[PDB]
Structure formats: structure tokens, C-alpha cells
């Protein structure tokens, strides 16, 4: 493997990493669902500031 192939700052706890990225991919997605009254994966309106329609 080439010279640039190197680990910089030790090993990675992979189980804790995918655990951390699932909590924060959910965090921003939940805050976006709480910002627009719209769960985007469920693709359904919720209740709050906006009155959601359909043309």
C-alpha cells in the first residue's frame, strides 16, 4: 500500500461509531421534522405552525 495509507489517531470503536451516527442522523432529521411539522421518511403532515395542504 502507498505511503499516504496510514492511520492518524489510533483505532476506531466501530460499534460506537455507527451507534453515534444513527443517533445524529436521527437528531437532525427529528429537528427538521419538528421545524416543518412534516416527518420526511413517513411523508405525512403533522400539527403545528404550518397548515399542510395537498394540491
Amino acid at each position: 500500500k502507498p505511503s499516504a495509507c496510514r492511520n492518524l489517531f489510533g483505532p476506531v470503536d466501530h460499534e460506537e461509531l455507527t451507534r453515534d451516527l444513527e443517533k445524529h442522523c436521527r437528531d437532525m432529521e427529528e429537528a427538521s421534522q419538528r421545524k416543518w411539522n412534516f416527518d420526511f421518511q413517513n411523508h405525512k403532515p403533522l400539527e403545528g405552525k404550518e397548515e399542510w395542504q395537498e394540491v
Partner: protein, 243 residues
Amino acid sequence: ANLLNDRVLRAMLKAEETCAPSVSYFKCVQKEVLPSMRKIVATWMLEVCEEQKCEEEVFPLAMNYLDRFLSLEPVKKSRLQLLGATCMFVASKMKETIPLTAEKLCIYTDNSIRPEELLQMELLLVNKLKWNLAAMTPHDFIEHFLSKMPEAEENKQIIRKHAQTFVALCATDVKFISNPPSMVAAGSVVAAVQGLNLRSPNNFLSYYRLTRFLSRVIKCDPDCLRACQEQIEALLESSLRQA
């Protein structure tokens, strides 16, 4: 004419003010990482972009993504390399025809990160930046400056290449996070015109007229541009010392 007013250049200086990282994310946001660790990872990404013969904008654009994510989220020491590999993964998609594969970037980490971990970090990085990936690069301002300089195309290619080297060295240094891409590009051009002190510059447009022209289009005092040029040439001296 628009060449007399330059509506394009003013639009570029307005767009540079949005994709801007913070000056003090080391003191205020980051707990585990220190400016010595940013230089380490930045040095690694530059070697990756040089081995893979990436487009000239990929490494500085990735450093722009990295400094902007570190201005928003505290990143662990063990995940700084993952953030760096992800910033190159997105920048390569924005600037290259056939971008770097996720599997090659994991190899460049000595297989420290996994492909899906990079793909999941891609969604996190792009959402955290709110898809503001079309940042203004110093290369954008370099091409605009060279289009206003009455120099031979052969002389422009040396200036363009020398400035691109200066731009890359600025991205590895912490002292240039506060500088906008216009300032980095302008200082890289006037430093490159001096020709690495290998030759007394013979340019059709004098250096005095060049620096004062560049200072009035990027809106700064000429002494401020000279101090940026001095910091860049000081970076060149320190970079060559590491051998």
C-alpha cells in the same frame, strides 16, 4: 461594458461570505482536537490528493468542508480522519469527472474506516452544512485575476501552478482559516509573480500595478495584501524545512 464594471467579481465576493468557517472553533467548539492535529490530517489529505492526481480544487475545498464542520460539531480525536476522508469524498464529487471511490479513501486510512461508515458520514456532513457545498474556491479568484492580467499564456501557466501550490500550503496552515478565498488567491498570485526568487520578474504588468489592482477589487489596503504575501512565503520556507 461588463469588463469595466465586473459584476461577476462582485458576485463572487458576496458568495464567499456564506461558506465561511469560524476563527476560534479550537477554543470554543472542539475539545479533543487541537490545531496540531488539523495540520496532521490536512497533510495527509494533501498527499492523497497528490497521489490520486485530483483536480486542483479538491483538497482546498475539502479543507473548507472540514473547518466548517469543526465550527459546528465537536469531533473526537479518533474520528478526525473519518471527517477528513469524508470531506475529500464530497469535494471530489463536486470538482472531478470520475470522483474518488469510497473504497480507495478507506484504503488511504490504512483501512481504519469502513465504506458504509464513510457513506453515513457523508449524509451527516452534507446535512450539517445544509448542502452548501458550492463554496467559492481560491481557484475561482485565481482564474478571474489571470483573465485581467496582460501576460503570455506560457507565463500564466507558471503563475497558475505556483499559486495553486501556495493555495494548498495555506489550507494546511491554521493562520489562514480567517482569510477569505479572495485574499488567499490574491496573495498567492502576487507571491507567484515574484517567481520563487529564482529570477527577477519580467511581467508585462508591473508588480506595483498588480498588487494595487488586486487590492482594490478584493477591497483591502495594499499593506494588508503584502502581509498576506509575506505569510505565504513564510509558509513556503517552513514547508521546505521539513525534509
